[PDB]
Structures are given as C-alpha cells and as structure tokens.
Amino acid sequence: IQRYVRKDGKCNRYLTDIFTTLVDLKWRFNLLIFVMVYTVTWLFFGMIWWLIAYIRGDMDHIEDPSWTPCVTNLNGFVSAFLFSIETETTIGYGYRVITDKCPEGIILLLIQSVLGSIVNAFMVGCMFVKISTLVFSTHAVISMRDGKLCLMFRVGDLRNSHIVEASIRAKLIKSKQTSEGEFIPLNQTDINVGYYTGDDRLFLVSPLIISHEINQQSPFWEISKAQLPKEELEIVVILEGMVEATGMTCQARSSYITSEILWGYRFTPVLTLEDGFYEVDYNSFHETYETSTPSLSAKELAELANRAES
Amino acid sequence: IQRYVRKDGKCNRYLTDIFTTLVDLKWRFNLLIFVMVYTVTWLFFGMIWWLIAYIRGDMDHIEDPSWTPCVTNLNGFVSAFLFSIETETTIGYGYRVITDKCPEGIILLLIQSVLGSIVNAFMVGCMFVKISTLVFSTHAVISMRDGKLCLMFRVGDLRNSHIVEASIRAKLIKSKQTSEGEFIPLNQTDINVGYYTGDDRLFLVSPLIISHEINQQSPFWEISKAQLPKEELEIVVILEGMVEATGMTCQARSSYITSEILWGYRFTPVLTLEDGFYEVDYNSFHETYETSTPSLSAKELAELANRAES
Amino acid sequence: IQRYVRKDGKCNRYLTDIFTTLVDLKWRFNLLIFVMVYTVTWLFFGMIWWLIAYIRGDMDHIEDPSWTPCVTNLNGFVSAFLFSIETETTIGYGYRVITDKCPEGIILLLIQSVLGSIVNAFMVGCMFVKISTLVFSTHAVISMRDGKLCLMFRVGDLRNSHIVEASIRAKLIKSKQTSEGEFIPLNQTDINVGYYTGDDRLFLVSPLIISHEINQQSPFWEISKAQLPKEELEIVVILEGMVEATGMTCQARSSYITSEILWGYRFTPVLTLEDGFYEVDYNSFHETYETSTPSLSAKELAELANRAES
Amino acid sequence: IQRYVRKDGKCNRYLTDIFTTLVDLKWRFNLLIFVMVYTVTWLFFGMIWWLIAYIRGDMDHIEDPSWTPCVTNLNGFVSAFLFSIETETTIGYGYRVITDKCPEGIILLLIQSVLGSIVNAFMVGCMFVKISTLVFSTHAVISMRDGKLCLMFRVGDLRNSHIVEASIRAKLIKSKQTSEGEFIPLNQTDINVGYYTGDDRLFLVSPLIISHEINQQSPFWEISKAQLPKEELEIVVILEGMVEATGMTCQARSSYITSEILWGYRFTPVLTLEDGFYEVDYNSFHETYETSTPSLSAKELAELANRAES
C-alpha cells in the first residue's frame, strides 16, 4: 500500500475457524446460541417420537387392551415434546412409561442421551474459554536535545491504569540499493531505543518520550531536513507490555511516514504538579510545539562540532 | 503524591469488572454465593410453577372429580416447591406428575432447564478459575567497596522455599533539564545492576546485597555526601522471579527515596555458617552498621586518585 | 545420519503416553470413541443386571405373586438393557423399580453410579483439552552485499496474515578439530544474524532475506568457493515468531548441507510493486538467479582488500 | 551445609497446601479418593434419613392402614440408603415416595443437592488440574582446549527428544572477601558460558561439553591445580530447555565442589561412530580420562606465555 502498517495496530470458506471464533463472542450471544441448540435438539427428538407414534396413533389411544398396537412412551398425542424434554434433560417423571417390552426403536433414546452429553460437553467447553489501551503520538518529532539531534515519539496509556514494565522496539523499513546493485524492496533496519544499555524496558506510569539518538550507527545518521521530505522511509514501533494481573505482552503497533515526522518541533509537557497530584492532560498529550532545532544534517552537525574543537 | 511508588508494590458502574473480581473470591465466599444463587432459583421457580395451577388449585385440590379440571400437576397449594426442586435438580420424582396431558404451559419447564444448565455452567466456570514473598531493605546504603564507591540494597526471600531465576532491574526517576531548556518531569535512566554481564539474572538462596557500582555511566557519578541529601531523586527496583516449587512468575516492586538512601553504611551479616547450617537472622536484614567511607563523590574520588597520581 | 536435521522440522507399550496422545485426537475420532465407550459401559451394566436377577428371573417373573421372590427390579429377562440405560444416564423412569424388598443385593447400582460419574468426569476433561507456518529457502545462497561477502537464506511466511516479532537463531554444527587433538563429532558454533545489533527480533510482512556477514568472528570466515563443496558443515536455523492474529510460538528447523549452500546466487524478489500494489508470490520464493559473486575466500578477499588499501 | 546445592536439583499446620498436594496425586489415587468421598456423602445422608425415621418409625410405616405417621419418604426400615442414592445422584424412581404433604422438614433434600453438586464440581476440578530428563557430568573437568585453559562440564538429555533452546547459566558461589574486611558468605559471580556471545541457547541432540574459557574476567583466573583443593569454590549450573512439541520449560539444577573439579581430564566422546554411523552411549557420558595439560595457573600461564613472547 502507500502506508505499510496502519496507525491502529494492523498491517496493510472454512468450517473449523468459524467454530473457533464462535467461542470468542459476547456473553449474550453465547447464552443465546447455547439455548437455541438445546431447543433444536429437543424439537428434533420430539418429532422423532411422533414418527414412532405412527405405529399406534389410532389403534388403542385409550383402549388399553393387553396390546395397544405396540404402544411406546405411552403418549396419545403429537404433543409428546414432554417425553423428549424429560429424556434429554434426564428428568424422566414416569407419568409417561419410559417404554413397553414392545420392540420399538429404543436406539432413539440411546441417541438422545449420547447427543445431549456431547452437545452439553461442547457448550461447557465454549462457556469455559469465553469466561476464562496504549497510545502513541500522532506526529513523531525531531528535536535537538543535550547537544544531539534526536527522534522522539511519545508513549502513554489513556486509562488511569498503566501496564508497567513495558518494552519498546523500533524498525525502520525502507528500500535499499546495495553496492553490487541489489534492490531490496523492503529493507528492515533496527533502530536503537536503548537496547544496548538495557533502556528498552521502561515504566510508563506517566506519558513519556521514547528517544532515539541519531549517531553514526543509527539509520538516520545522514538524514537532513533537506532530503527528509522526499525519502519514503517508514518507522514501525511495537510495544510489548505484561499486564499487571496475569501479565502477557500485548503488541501495540504504530507507524510514522515521512509526513508524520516533523523537524524543528518537540512534544509539549503533559505533567504539571498541583496539590501533590500531577495534572496529566491527554488533550495536549499529542500536541507539539516549535523549538529552535538546527536544520543541518546530524553528520553535518558532528562535523561542525569537530571543526569547533580543532 | 511526592513519593512516586510506595514501598509495598503499589504506584502512587462496570458489570464485567465486578463479575471478574467475583470469580477471584475466597473458597468460602465462592461456595456461599454458589448455594445462594441456587436457593434463589429454586424459590422463584416454585412461585412461578404455583401460578400455573391457580385456576385448578382451589377447584379440586384433592377432590379429583372424574379427572376434570386436570391441573397439569398433582401438587397441592402448600409446599409445591418440591416440584421446583425436582425440575431444576433433574431428580424428577413421579409422586407429582411433571405435566398432565392437559396442555396449560409446558414452557415453564424449558425455562427452568436452560436456566439451571446455564447457572450450573457459570458456577462451575467460576469454581474452575478460583481453584486453578520477596523483601527489600528498609534503607538502601552507599559505601566504598573493593576500591570503588558503590550503592547497595538487600534483596531477600521471606520463605525458605526458593525463588529461582530472580532478575533485578533498577530505574532512577529524577527531573532532567536538557541543554535546549525543555524540562522532563519524570526522566527514567537505567542503573547497571549487572545487565551486561548477566549478573542481573541471579538465584537468591538467602538475602544477597545487590550492588551497583557508581561509575562514569552511573546516574550517581557526581554525587558527594553533601549532594545526596539535596537531591530528591527516587529509585524504583523490581525483582521478577519464579518459584522453585512451581513455575509461576512473581514481580515484586519497591522504592527508595532520598530519606531512605543512607551514606557511609554497610549491611550487617544475615548468614553465619556453623552447627551444620547457615544461622539465618531477618532481624539484622533491615538493620545496618556504619562504616568509614570517603565523603567525596565517586567522580571526586577518581579525581582524588588522579591527584595521588599527580 | 548423512543429514543431521531434516528439512521439515525433525531431527534425525506405555499406557500413560498413548492415553496422553489419545486426548490429542481429531474431533470426529474423539466423539466416536466417546459414544462407543458410553455404549460399551451401558452394554456391561445390562448384562450384570441379568445375573443379579438370575435367581428370581423365573421364580416370581412367571408367578407375578405378592412379595414372593420379588425380583431386584420389576423387569423381564429380555430387553433388560432399558434398566441399565435408565440407571447409568440418571433418567430413573420408574416403570422398572430401582430396588425391591427381598433385594438379593443392591450393591451393583452403587458401582454403576460411581463408574458412570468417573467416566463422564474423565471424558469431559479430554474433550476440554482437545477443544481448548514458515518456509525456508531450499538453497541458502552466498552473495556480495554492501562491499562484503554474505551468507543469506530466505524466510517466508506462507500465511497471508503476517508473522510478527520473529527471532532467528543460526547454529553451525561441524566436526571441529581442536589444537589439543580432541575431535569433537558435533561442535556447535553460533552464527551472528544480528543478535548484538538487535536485528534478530525481526518483523516480516513478506518473505525476507536473513543475512549473515562473514567477518573474523564468523564460523565460515575462511570457507572458500573451491572448498564450499568439500566441507561437511551443516547449518540449523530456528525461527520463533508470533502471528499477527495470535501470539503463537513455533519452531522451524532447517538444514543447509554443503551442497545446498550455493556460491554465486541471490534470491528472487517475492514482492511485486504496481503503483502501490504489493503482491506476494510463494511460487518464486525458492528461485535464485546468479551473480558474479567473488569466488575468493572471505578471509582471503579481506586480506586482498587490505593489501590494496596499503 | 557442606554442599550448598545437591546434585539432583535440590538446594540444601497448613489447611490450604494439603488440598494442592491432594490435586497433585496419581490418577488411581484421585479416582480412589473421589469414590471414597461419594460413598461417605451417600452413607452420611442415609443415616440422616434413618434419623428422620425417628418421628414415624412404624405407626403406619409398614401396615399403612391410615395416613397417620405418613412418612417423609415411604421407607419401612433403617436400610433407606436406596433413597439416599436416588436423591443425591438424581435417579429418583418414585417406588420410594419422594415427599409427602405432612413432612417435618424437606430442607435435607436441598442440603443433599447442594453438597452433591459441590462434591461433583470439586472432584471434576481436581481431575481436570491433574490431567491438564537433563543430566550432568558427575564431576566437572578443567582441561587445555584449543591452546587455552578451559573449564568443561558435559551436559545432555537422556531422552532422544530434540529439546530446543537449552539455555545454560553458571553461577560460582564463594566466600569472597572485600578490601573493607566484610566478606559476603555467599558471593554469586557470573561465569561466561556464552551469554555475551549468544551461544547460551545450545541444542542437546548429542551430549555436548559446555566450555567456559578462563580469562582475566573469569572467576578462576588465578586458580591452579595444586591450589584447587584448598579453595571452597562451588559451581551451580542451571539449564532451561523446551521440548519439541511446544513443551513447557524444564529447569535442571546441578552443582560441583572443589574436589569434584579435576585437572587434565577430558570427557571421552559420548557418541563414537560405529560402522559409519556415530553411536550414542549414555553409559560413556560420565566417563573421563587423564590428558596431558600444564599444571600452572591460568593467570600464571598467561604471564609465562607473555614472557616467552615478550
């Protein structure tokens, strides 16, 4: 596409996967499907019972002789759904005699019991799996901090709750042409976010600015304001944080195209102490303000520094 | 609050969230709620079942004249809750006929069956999730050790059962002022407790003093004894380890403020080995005993060594 | 063997183990064995009942007298499987009485009930455990990249969903000869695929070329194009990554024997770019087209470059 | 103790942990205890039913001339354990009267139902939790490898399964003495078994000799053969591996002592080729032989080599 990975976390005929994702449903949808399957099974078994009643429908409905046709289930009407409910739900009341010695399809009862236990097991499994928030800045910025040009992207958690001890990874994807003439459509170069020093794992208790220093080994070493607009480089940032309870790393992914990166601006502070509690403005959490950042190349700035040292 | 993370492990209208907290309950609380929901279901079902026979309940309670006004039940006005218990718990005794041929409403027993299965499934699921110790020094200290100024804090296991694969990470939170003049309220800079050499990952069999050397890279590089009181920088130290008995990872957080960071001290001995075993005293683990350590800063101590070189 | 680890992922009387793998069965096989075992348990219960009633199967069956050799149950000798189905499935219809005076032993019912509960409990857990792809290029290649010789192997995600957070680890197993004189049959030397730089934890949208630079530290540092056929060195590469949809860890072992690792070839581009249209074809993933890669030994080539520099 | 951690993996009043130990039982023990629990529940309820027989023992209990002393359950004798089995496991027949309209309390049925459901749920949960190989060389050896002194300890997996990512970590515990005169009784100093080079996650298809080179940073940098016995160094090695089929992490802990470390010893090849195919001999795993090595210290050896080369 134009943008490789979208800003939310997405990059840009099967009868088994539908069953797998059916367990991943809202509780109301799950209970609704759970009642519907049972109702269908009861209705089908009741229809089966009426088909077994074709043998004795009119011969001795109330004659009660020594042999009434071959009475099975002792029910005189098509409303034998009572017998079906009692057999499936294992609540046989005996008002309807389970069966006579007459050779009916007792195997129909064998099917109801196994099917019910199997349907019940499936429903229990579906109930078991079903019952058992990070934000990045809109515009990553470039600013001059502590004598070095740096690339800054802010990270936070919108909710008051924060998933502490997060880890950050940054990958710059852009096309590279090598010395031999090899063209790689999507070259991936990792960005230092403190991995060497162990600074990747950090606390986000407040919204904080993740900083990549531009240096000789950095992918941006020779990036300058002059050519940064044209270059199609794309930055993709993945954040993995283990939740406070039953912690598991959740991948919060964002992207920054050359348009989103801004030169000469830096994020505007989000923390201000009032009455011992630090006001956190999520409205200004993304907002960036102009700073006096040199427009020369980072390598050019280093060369100017060495010239000054002499 | 002025102190960011407290010493214990804490930093300083929803139907689903309360339901999630309810599954996380004591065993006694869980069995109590499990019996209470069933009792409510049985009582409600008894009342609703009583409503169906209201027309024939007084018409012929025991008269049964020529089997007329069939009640769709053989139950009497009082203690008809037995029919509710039989329907919900699937005992299905035939003393009271579940449903007479007279139709009335047979859908009441369908509702009871689905509700009972659903309530049973939810209770089983809540029961399934329910069934299925590190300590830090009160005061961190600084002393001269092995020719280098160092910062030490005790880390111990309260229970004799060991915690394997303990990893210790220390992050110092203080407000940095950049060269540009952009103020960072909560700048987090990592402290090297052995991450490079793999000394970070340690097996704690007894309380062991984790030590960070104050070198050029250390945030404390230029902290003299006079400076340590002045600065309000805070340490946050986290130990993540799994139990020896079971592979369950526990994360224990702790904090240290300038008030609890002492100078010219060293921890006392927790273990003295004699009589066939280590003599373990946790009385002295929190306690410290003073030492004579140069008041000059670590950078200043290296400067003093340079002066000795002259 | 000739090849240590095969190309797919494989390297080259117990009641508990077969039982453990039995839970890992196809859904159809599991439901089939479940219904079959339930039917078998029911068939056995019916047979034991005939033996229990064997003494009174005639004596009071023919007489139909009052409490005189009254049978254990009010059932006939033939079609007595109904009693077993009712007792085991907990239907308890009551046309046949559960136990009578002059019982002749009611112990069988206790055994049947415990066995039935145990069977259901055991086979619900099996149902629960049961209900609750990266391709490597066939031929690793050697190409001249960025002014240095490099060993590169293509990794492809067959699934349209992109694999995320993939870590690559490469180990060269060779018959190392020590200077001491010890001959190590299977000496494992790790290969640097970006571990220090952090490039191992790569993000693959499309099949990408994993590259190892042949430097002094590299195991194949002195390997030569003439000797590339001679050697018996084998490369084992393992990829552990998370799917975008799900965080599932997998292992994909591969082998690159002396013959499979070509010299002078570079991979075929998988991605087709059409005005922002990205197409990934796995038909061309394995193809390699030749380049005039320098055939001198990497160490020899570096030394020649050094001599040229002078 | 004399030895801190034993060679197998061990280092050297509660009503909650007993339940955990009971869930952690053999399958036979779990089914046995469950059947015993069911028998206890039924037997206790049956007595209680005989106690309910106190109010109406024989007034119309047998003869039944009138409804006087109409029984809660129509059971003539103390052997009313048929009623207990029927009520608790929900197979009520009705040959024995379920309830009457003259009872002294039918709360016992409610108690029986709740206890039975709770017992079944607990016994299903226990069954669910219940249903749902590394070895080291007996004595480590210090030998001359590739012209440099090294510490070698052989580790392998007995089962042929291809355990993956068998990361190995070595910690040397000794009573190190500081310049201050305060000696930590246990000082954990990390040993570089490949963590710096990324060689730690070794494969164990063939038993393989883990090698630690002795350099300036190595703990044994100054140790010598004749001086090895006097020292108190204790080496503890922990190996973590995963089985092929996404197996759970398995942690094996082993130890060594001063007299279990030997000089000029090389493990004999665990696998020796037979008939053109290498043969695995777990009998030869622990086997060692005396090899020709120099007896001087590693630091002293380095100084001697430097003197020879000036």
Residue numbers in the entry:
A (entry chain B), B (entry chain C), C (entry chain A), D (entry chain D): 55 to 66, 77 to 196, 204 to 381
From the paper:
All Kir channels are tetramers of identical or related subunits that encode a K+ selectivity filter-containing transmembrane pore (TMD for transmembrane domain) and a cytoplasmic domain (CTD). G-protein-gated inward rectifier K+ (GIRK) channels are activated by both PIP2 and Gβγ.
In the absence of PIP2 it is clear that GIRK2 can adopt a conformation in which the CTD is disengaged from the TMD and the TMD-CTD linker has to be extended to account for the separation between the TMD and CTD. Thus, in the absence of PIP2, the global conformation of GIRK2 appears much like the Kir2.2 channel in the absence of PIP2 (i.e. both channels adopt an extended conformation). The crystal lattice offers a possible explanation for conformational differences between CryoEMApo and CrystalApo. Because in the extended conformation the CTD and TMD are free to move with respect to each other without hindrance, these two structured regions may have been pushed together when the crystal was formed. Four classes (1-4) were similar to each other and showed a disengaged CTD (i.e. extended conformation) with an unresolved TMD-CTD linker. The sidechains of positively charged residues that coordinate PIP2 are disordered in the CryoEMApo structure. In the absence of PIP2, the inner helix gate of GIRK2 is most tightly constricted at position Phe192 in the inner helix, which lines the pore on the intracellular side of the selectivity filter.
